[PDB]
Design an enzyme around this catalytic site. Structure first.
Site, short mmCIF file in Angstrom:
data_model
loop_
_atom_site.label_atom_id
_atom_site.label_comp_id
_atom_site.label_asym_id
_atom_site.label_seq_id
_atom_site.Cartn_x
_atom_site.Cartn_y
_atom_site.Cartn_z
N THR A 1 0.89 -1.17 -0.02
CA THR A 1 0.04 0.09 0.20
C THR A 1 0.82 1.33 0.03
O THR A 1 1.08 2.01 1.05
CB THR A 1 -0.73 -0.10 1.28
OG1 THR A 1 -0.11 0.07 2.39
CG2 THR A 1 -1.78 -1.46 1.19
N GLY A 2 1.48 1.55 -1.09
CA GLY A 2 2.18 2.62 -1.37
C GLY A 2 1.53 3.90 -1.50
O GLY A 2 2.13 5.06 -1.64
N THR A 3 0.26 4.08 -1.60
CA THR A 3 -0.74 5.07 -1.76
C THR A 3 -0.53 6.07 -0.56
O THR A 3 -0.03 5.58 0.49
CB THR A 3 -2.11 4.66 -1.84
OG1 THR A 3 -2.26 3.55 -1.04
CG2 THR A 3 -2.12 3.91 -3.50
N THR A 4 -1.05 7.36 -0.68
CA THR A 4 -1.22 8.17 0.39
C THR A 4 -2.52 8.16 1.25
O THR A 4 -3.38 7.68 0.60
CB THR A 4 -1.13 9.74 -0.20
OG1 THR A 4 0.28 9.87 -0.65
CG2 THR A 4 -1.47 10.56 0.89
#
Lengths: 168, 99, 219, 175, 233, 238, 251, 89, 235
Positions: free
Chosen positions: C40-43
């Site tokens: 989960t590299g999302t912001t």
């Protein structure tokens, strides 16, 4: 150089001996680390003898192959420097002949023919399920000649049982 | 050496938990509290299924205060469903300390 | 049957680790092609305002912990789902014993302690936000077990722009629509995509196909 | 550490297709439910064997059949058991629900991470480009034959296509 | 007499009886009446709570407690053992939900708790839990009702009774209970059964009713059980 | 008395619990062992054949290593446990020494297990006595015995279990060397011993044969019937 | 006899363990359970003994359990202990299958559970389970099999057996009306229902008093199933009609 | 020792009461021979470790003291050892 | 009469508030042989009266360089206590590099022998130890009653017929302080002979003497070595 050729009613191995039999109708061919290979062979032979004589019947080549795959995976998992490649030739009373390719990482695979690349390429060029013993010996000789261009002592696991054949 | 930094951290997580609990109690309450708790844990552990079956250890968790708590050890690998099992007499002897 | 004495136990198995490392060393120089981890590299974003909490996850990364506690997820995926699920079950048991809704402080403590016990070897960079008896709280979990209860917090890919947006456009004790538009602005900066604004309010080429082995098994 | 496999959805029919050259990737985890282990051969075999052990215990105790969602959860738990020292497997789970017979397809991680879609899921070393090709080729609604062609072409861009149709499953090794 | 066997839990009587488990079941039978009825729309778990004194606070220990969102239970016998087993039941349900992401079937939870009790019934050093669990729940659009015993043996039921005059309660249930019996009147049947096995006057604070339907388990409030009592009489 | 605890002694100096385990051993059916030349036999009493029963599932004679076997008398399950553990020990010894075990070795292990289980009150002593026979390896036929007490003794001819005294006295009379001159002679000797023990022969004899370089060969009922018919013919001659 | 029965680990002058004998008495107090080997397969004709009018049927079977793809068993004893014992059976079978990828031979599983029970008998502080299980199954080695273990772990091979209530009479009458090598599963069920009729004198066979299982081999697959209520009703009706015809013939 | 042969068929070699614990050490057994097995095994082990480490001969007093230390453990054994030895070396 | 219920276990009080097992251990030590211990300003002397053919027992033991003991009870518990004492002294001299104080060692033995009395599944150490020693503050003669509690003594005796020796030591309790090693030893021998029947007189093979002194370290004296003292000993 452990070349195996499964046939209609036999499995012609060709060791470089490496032929450590586990029980009747079972023959394991071990190659790799010298110390680890023989220790593993002895361990599996003892385990199969225990099973045989505790239950009154021996492990079939398929069952022995599965148990050996499990144990080899465990052994590599317990200590990394256990690089041990196997080739379990055997005959099953019901199933029939059974050759089993297995790499050092204990990836069991039933093999119409196997070797532990040059030897396998010759087998790939010529092989048939309806093969005779002498044909498999000729195949082994050709594979050995190809490997030399780039021993082969053979035994078979026949319905009669394990036999010693003219060394190649 | 171990197979992972967390290998020993979680091989002995409970051991360290009890060790720290008893250290704090000795420092604050005194000698009596660790002694009492050890006695209760020992008494409850003396009575359970034989080692070749899966003990519930219900009352042990109730004393420990984790009978209504869930951890990764509870779900990930289930000792109730084991993949390799030793002989009954063999493991009972091992538990008794004969082997 | 033989060579097995100790009774079984539960927990993570670290047996594969050593052979795995040696094989990676082997594959690194010849063979490669090893499965990797989807993460989960999302912001993620979150703010605390007058009447509750608002979280943002562009991705969703929001995870139900309790009816009044929710938690965003950054870092690694499997790690964050497993962590959130375990703490959710723990808080569910705690609530069942209590008959009361679980507190956000309890969730923060559980997450912090468990993640510190795992020493940040599982990637769960979370933004724990909810409301409880005490009131709305906005913690910021870290993989190594460190928490900050700040008015606004972000982490992920474009988390720095979201933090700048929060810092510039935030005033103490925002309101419902103002709070969820500030988080949307901050989470929108992370994108620069649909966002799951979680408002925890206090009041609420015909290849040759030649068949070779055709078989059927009627059922 | 080779091996790739994908799944596709249809109308009461779901397909899962792996490649061959040299190990099993399509293990039947149920009468109309299969698995898509992809990666190191030994790891694939170990995961399949222990998963089937758990599945058999579950089926014996419960009296019902594992459902695709439950099978996915079990696989995720099994893979997460070895989170440290991960299994080199990316199970792709395709099959019909034993009760409602509804298509289901999903892909997992080396440590277990559920990822469910309704068009297609791909796993393996070249999974990204294969999935891109499927996207270029995929369509909403299939019959068992149309579904078979779609997954087969996508894999080729032999392929053992197991179209799981509630009437009966069909397997075909293409080229 | 056979007293040596009466005292010991880990011994078989000459006839082959586990007397300690029999005494645990006697404790169960000497508990508060508890009637469970498996209706068509749902199930009912009604009992006779022992909080009839005005001092006894209502928002306190509840005879009927939930394990999951779709499972609840009632007991007859020892309150402490009941609460400990409820904690274990919730632990097991959460374990199952985290392993499978699926609601624990009622049968599976009953199996797990019954095995837990059998664990203490088997070994020497502890005593059988002097309490029997009337566990109910709802799965796959079907009502469920089970009865656990200190022996660790458990059975499925359509309508059963516990506590005092529990044999009379079961006879009354057999007299009244119908297979087609629906909810919202199975509650009336349970109320009448507890009245048949009552001691005193029937008050909304003298009973504790919990029903589990498609929606799930829910402990009824004093107002609801008061309305049911008013409708009964 | 002092017979309610394996730990406590008696002023006589007896551990009556172990003697009661030996009494249970005596309760078991007869087992007869004869140590001949290039042959060892384990005749067992098979009186209770019953009906709708499988003789394959329940037998007294079991192998311990490739060159040693045993027959017991007493608690069947205890003997089963001891047999399994003895097989495990034999295979472990072959693993670590690479050579086959000696009859004395596995007898030692079985006696050590019985001694281990007679140590404490918690563990009761295994209520079976084993007639362990076979060949050492170099070709020396061996006969041995074990008891719950946990000690072993080599023998030339021994009978245990039901009516042990009569059978062992018959062996004392008739063991000699002319009765072990041949394997057939040993088989006839054990069959006659069990005839003195059990009324019927052939159908009531579970006999086993193990020659110098042969594995455990449990004789079929027809072969034992032929042997006992030979004994009857010899009796008719005299 | 009021001595040497305080513990399971204590012998008597005669060399007897009274605790396991009392466990067998408890078995005797259980309900009738039959098992008959046959050429076609093997059956387990058990006594349901679930005759309450407020009892549910939400389970596969009360007496009959399934261990693996190749095995099934009945139970006659203490239900609580039998549950854990059957769970152990299933777990052992699955362990062997996982290790060897072949169904566990019936004798091996029987012996493993007998080891469990005799281990609980062996050590002090543990009560012998007091459950007798009636195993059936098929394997490559001995084909169809019928086994029966007791609380003490003593297990035997059988062609026809009974455990629980009126077991001695049932076994005697089975061996009075059993043929070795001739009985087919048809005649096996007929004999089983006859024995149940003539042993269970509490009430006539109402087809809910009875719970009969079947284990056959079709397509080289062990088919473990349970006779439908219709099937057991047909069995009962056939037996009763044949008995009436025999009585008429006797005159 | 007066070794007691119960029957003429018994092998006197197996009933030996006098044993060897080391070349320079010997003992005679009398009583519960089963426990004497453990006792003399402990003595043999002790003298073997002595020869391995110090490469000398254990004193008779020292080996009997070690095997006594084994025998002191009762109430390992749960009952007093029921056999006596005569360590003649 | 009524004490049978409470006189078999050591962890149960009697209605009269007594643990009779401890008293029975104190009787066991009494049933043992008589030994004597006494010290001068510069020496601590132990004299023990041994038990026909076959050698006798070692009542006097060298537990440490400067500590010695005499046993008057059960041999097994005596051996265990001697082993523990020797281990404690060895550890002290190895780590702390200090000759372990005799009083400290006696306190350790007191605690060790107190353990079993309050613990179930154990019996009190049925042995009385006359511990001689010398360090720091002169000689140290002690007595560890099998009941954990112990006493410090200028002179002492314990065993069977030991009351006569105790009386004789009391007669000259003050003399021992101002005595030479020889005279102290002779006083010990006379105390021992008090325990012997009037007919018997001390021989060389029924007497062992343990002597630790200012410059001297503990040593056990055999028949030949005890003959000097017996030669000159007044009848």
């Amino acid at each position: 150089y452990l070349i195996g050729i499964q046939g209609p009613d036999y499995v012609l191995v060709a060791s470089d001996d490496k032929m450590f039999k586990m029980s009747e109708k079972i023959l394991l061919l071990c190659v790799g680390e010298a110390g680890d290979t023989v220790q593993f062979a002895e361990y599996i032979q003892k385990n199969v003898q225990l099973y045989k004589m505790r239950n009154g019947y021996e492990l079939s080549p398929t069952a022995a192959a599965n148990f050996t795959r499990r144990n080899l995976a465990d052994c590599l998992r317990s200590r990394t420097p256990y690089h041990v490649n196997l080739l379990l030739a055997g005959y099953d009373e019901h199933e029939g002949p059974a050759l089993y390719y297995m790499d050092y990482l204990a990836a069991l695979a039933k093999a119409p023919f196997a070797a532990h690349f040059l030897t396998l390429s010759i087998l790939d060029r010529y092989y048939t399920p309806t093969i005779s013993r002498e044909r498999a010996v000729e195949l082994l000789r050709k594979c050995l000649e190809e490997l030399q261009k780039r021993t082969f002592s053979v035994r078979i696991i026949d319905k009669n049982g394990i036999h010693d054949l003219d060394n190649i | 050496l171990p197979s992972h930094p967390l290998e020993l951290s979680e091989k002995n997580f409970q051991l360290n938990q009890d060790k720290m609990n008893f250290s704090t109690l000795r420092n604050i309450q005194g000698l009596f509290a660790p002694l009492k708790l050890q006695m209760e844990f020992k008494a409850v552990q003396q009575v359970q299924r034989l080692p070749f079956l899966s003990s519930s250890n219900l009352s042990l968790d109730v004393l420990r205060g984790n009978d209504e708590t869930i951890g990764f050890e509870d779900i990930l690998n289930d000792p109730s469903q084991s993949e390799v099992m030793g002989e009954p007499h063999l493991m009972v002897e091992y538990k008794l300390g004969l082997l | 049957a033989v060579s097995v004495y100790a009774p079984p136990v539960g927990g993570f198995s670290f047996d594969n680790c050593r052979r795995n490392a040696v094989l990676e060393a082997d594959f690194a120089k010849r063979g490669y092609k090893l499965p990797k981890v989807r993460k989960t590299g999302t912001t993620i974003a979150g703010v605390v305002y007058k009447d509750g909490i608002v979280l943002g996850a562009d991705t969703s990364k929001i995870h139900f912990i309790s009816p009044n506690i929710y938690c965003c997820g950054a870092g690694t995926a499997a790690d964050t789902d497993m962590t959130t699920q375990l703490i959710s079950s723990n808080l569910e048991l705690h609530s069942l014993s209590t008959g009361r809704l679980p507190r956000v402080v309890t969730a923060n403590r559980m997450l912090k302690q468990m993640l510190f016990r795992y020493q940040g070897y599982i990637g769960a960079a979370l933004v724990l936000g909810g409301v409880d008896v005490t009131g709305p709280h906005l913690y910021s979990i870290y993989p190594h077990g460190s928490t900050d209860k700040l008015p606004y917090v972000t982490m992920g890919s474009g988390s720095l722009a979201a933090m700048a947006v929060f810092e510039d456009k935030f005033r103490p004790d925002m309101e419902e629509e103002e709070a969820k538009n500030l988080v949307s602005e901050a989470i929108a900066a992370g994108i620069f995509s649909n966002i799951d604004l979680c408002v925890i309010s206090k009041n609420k080429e015909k290849g040759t196909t030649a068949v070779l082995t055709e078989k059927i098994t009627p059922l | 550490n080779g091996g790739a496999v994908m799944a596709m959805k249809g109308k009461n029919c779901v397909a899962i297709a792996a490649d061959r050259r040299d190990f099993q990737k399509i293990f039947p985890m149920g009468d109309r439910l299969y698995i898509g282990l992809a990666g190191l051969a030994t790891d694939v075999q170990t995961v399949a064997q222990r998963l089937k052990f758990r599945l058999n215990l579950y089926e014996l105790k419960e009296g019902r059949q594992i459902k695709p969602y439950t099978l996915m959860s079990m696989v995720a738990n099994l893979l997460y058991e070895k989170r440290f020292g991960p299994y080199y497997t990316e199970p792709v789970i395709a099959g019909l629900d034993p009760k409602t017979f509804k298509p289901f397809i999903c892909s997992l991680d080396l440590i277990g991470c559920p990822m469910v879609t309704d068009d297609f899921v791909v796993s393996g070393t070249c999974a990204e480009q294969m999935y891109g090709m499927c996207e270029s080729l995929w369509e909403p609604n299939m019959d068992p034959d149309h579904l078979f062609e779609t997954i087969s072409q996508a894999m080729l861009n032999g392929v053992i296509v197991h179209i799981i149709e509630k009437d009966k499953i069909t397997t075909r090794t293409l080229k | 007499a056979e007293r040596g066997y009466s005292f010991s839990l880990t011994t078989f009587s000459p006839s082959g009886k586990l007397v300690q488990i029999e005494y645990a079941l006697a404790a169960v039978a000497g508990g508060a009446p508890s009637v469970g009825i498996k209706a068509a729309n749902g199930v009912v778990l009604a009992t006779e709570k022992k909080q009839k004194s005005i001092l006894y606070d209502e928002r306190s220990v509840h005879k009927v407690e939930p394990i999951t969102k779709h499972i609840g239970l009632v007991y007859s016998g020892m309150g402490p053992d009941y609460r400990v087993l409820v904690h274990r039941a919730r632990k097991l349900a959460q374990q199952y939900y985290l392993v499978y992401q699926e609601p624990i079937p009622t049968a599976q939870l009953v199996q797990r708790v019954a095995s837990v009790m059998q664990e203490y019934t088997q070994s020497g050093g502890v005593r059988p839990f002097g309490v029997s669990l009337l566990i109910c729940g709802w799965n796959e659009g079907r009502p469920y009702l089970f009865q656990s015993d200190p022996s660790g043996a458990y059975f499925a039921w359509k309508a059963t009774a516990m506590g005092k005059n529990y044999v009379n309660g079961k006879t009354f249930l057999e007299k009244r209970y119908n297979e087609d019996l629906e909810l919202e009147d199975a509650i009336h049947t349970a109320i009448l059964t507890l009245k048949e096995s009552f001691e005193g006057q029937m008050t909304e604070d003298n009973i504790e009713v919990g029903i589990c339907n498609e929606a799930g388990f829910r402990r009824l409030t004093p107002t609801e059980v008061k309305d049911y009592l008013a409708a009964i009489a | 008395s002092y017979d309610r605890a394996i730990t406590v002694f008696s002023p006589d100096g007896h551990l009556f619990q172990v003697e009661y385990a030996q009494e249970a051993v005596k309760k078991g059916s007869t087992a007869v062992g004869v140590r001949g030349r290039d042959i060892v036999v384990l005749g067992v009493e098979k009186k209770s054949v019953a009906k709708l029963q499988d003789e394959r599932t329940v037998r007294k004679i079991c192998a311990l290593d490739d060159n040693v076997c045993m027959a017991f008398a007493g608690l069947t399950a205890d003997a089963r446990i001891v047999i399994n553990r003895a097989r495990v020990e034999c295979q472990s010894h072959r693993l670590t020494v690479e050579d086959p075990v000696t009859v004395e070795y596995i007898t030692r292990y079985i006696a050590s297990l019985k001694q281990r289980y007679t140590q404490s009150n918690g563990r009761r002593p295994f209520g079976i006595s084993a007639l362990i026979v076979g060949f050492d390896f170099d070709g020396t036929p061996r006969l041995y015995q074990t008891d719950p007490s946990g000690t072993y003794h080599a023998w030339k001819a021994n009978a245990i279990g039901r009516g042990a005294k009569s059978v062992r006295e018959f062996l004392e009379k008739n063991y000699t060397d002319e009765a072990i001159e041949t394997d057939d002679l040993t088989i006839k000797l054990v069959i006659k011993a069990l005839l003195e023990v059990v009324q019927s022969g052939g159908k009531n004899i579970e006999l086993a044969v193990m020659r110098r370089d042969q594995s455990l060969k449990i004789l079929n009922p027809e072969e034992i019937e032929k042997y006992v018919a030979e004994i009857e013919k010899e009796k008719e001659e005299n | 006899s009021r001595r040497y029965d305080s513990r399971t680990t204590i012998f008597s002058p005669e060399g007897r363990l009274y605790q396991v004998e009392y466990a067998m008495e408890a078995i005797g107090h259980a309900g009738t359970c039959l098992g008959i080997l046959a050429n076609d397969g093997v059956l387990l004709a058990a006594e349901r003994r679930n005759i309450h009018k407020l009892l549910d049927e939400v389970f596969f079977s009360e007496k009959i359990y399934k261990l693996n793809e190749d095995m099934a068993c009945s139970v006659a004893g203490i239900t609580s202990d039998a549950n854990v014992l059957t769970n152990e059976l299933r777990l052992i079978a699955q362990r062997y299958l996982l290790q060897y990828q072949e169904p566990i031979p019936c004798e091996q599983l029987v012996t493993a559970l007998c080891d469990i029970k005799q281990a609980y008998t062996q050590f002090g502080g543990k009560r012998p389970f007091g459950v007798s299980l009636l195993y059936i199954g098929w394997d490559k080695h001995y084909g169809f099999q019928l086994y029966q273990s007791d609380p003490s772990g003593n297990y035997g091979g059988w062609k026809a057996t009974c455990i629980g209530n009126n077991s001695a009479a049932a076994v005697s009458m089975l061996k009075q009306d059993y043929k070795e090598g001739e009985m087919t599963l048809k005649s096996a069920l007929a004999l089983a229902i006859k024995v149940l009729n003539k042993t269970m004198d509490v009430s006539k066979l109402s087809a809910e008093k009875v719970e009969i299982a079947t284990l056959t081999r079709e397509n080289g697959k062990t088919v473990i199933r349970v006779l439908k209520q219709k099937e057991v009703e047909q069995l009962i009706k056939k037996h009763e009609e044949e008995e009436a015809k025999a009585e008429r013939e006797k005159k | 020792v007066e070794k007691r042969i119960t029957s003429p068929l018994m092998e006197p070699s197996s009933i030996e009461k006098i044993v060897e614990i080391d070349a320079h050490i010997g003992c005679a057994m009398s009583g519960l021979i089963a426990d004497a097995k453990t006792l003399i095994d402990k003595a043999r082990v002790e003298t073997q470790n002595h020869w391995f480490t110090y490469n000398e001969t254990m004193t008779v007093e020292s080996v009997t003291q070690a095997v006594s230390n084994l025998a002191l453990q009762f109430g390992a054994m749960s009952r007093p050892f029921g056999v006596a030895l005569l360590f003649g070396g | 009469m009524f004490r049978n219920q409470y006189d078999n276990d050591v962890t149960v009080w009697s209605p009269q508030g007594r643990i009779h097992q401890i008293e029975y251990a104190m009787e066991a030590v009494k049933q043992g042989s008589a030994t004597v211990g006494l010290k001068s300003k510069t020496h601590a002397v132990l004299v023990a009266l041994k038990r026909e053919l076959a050698a006798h027992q070692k009542k006097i033991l060298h537990v440490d360089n400067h500590i010695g003991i005499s046993i008057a009870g059960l041999t097994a518990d005596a051996r265990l206590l001697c082993n523990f004492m020797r281990q404690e002294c060895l550890d002290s001299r190895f780590v702390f590099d200090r000759p372990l104080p005799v009083s400290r060692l006696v306190s350790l033995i007191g605690s060790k022998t107190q353990i079993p009395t309050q613990r179930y599944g154990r019996r009190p150490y049925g042995v009385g130890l006359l511990i001689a020693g010398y360090d720091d503050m002169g000689p140290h003669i002690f007595q560890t009653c099998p009941s954990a509690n112990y006493f410090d003594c200028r002179a002492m005796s314990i065993g069977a017929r030991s009351q006569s020796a105790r009386t004789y030591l009391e007669r000259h309790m003050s003399e021992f302080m101002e005595c030479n090693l020889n005279e102290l030893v002779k006083h010990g021998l006379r105390a021992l002979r008090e325990t012997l029947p009037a007919e018997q007189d001390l021989t060389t093979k029924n007497v062992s003497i343990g002597i630790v002194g200012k410059d001297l370290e503990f040593t056990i004296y055999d028949d030949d070595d005890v003959s000097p003292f017996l030669e000159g000993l007044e009848e």
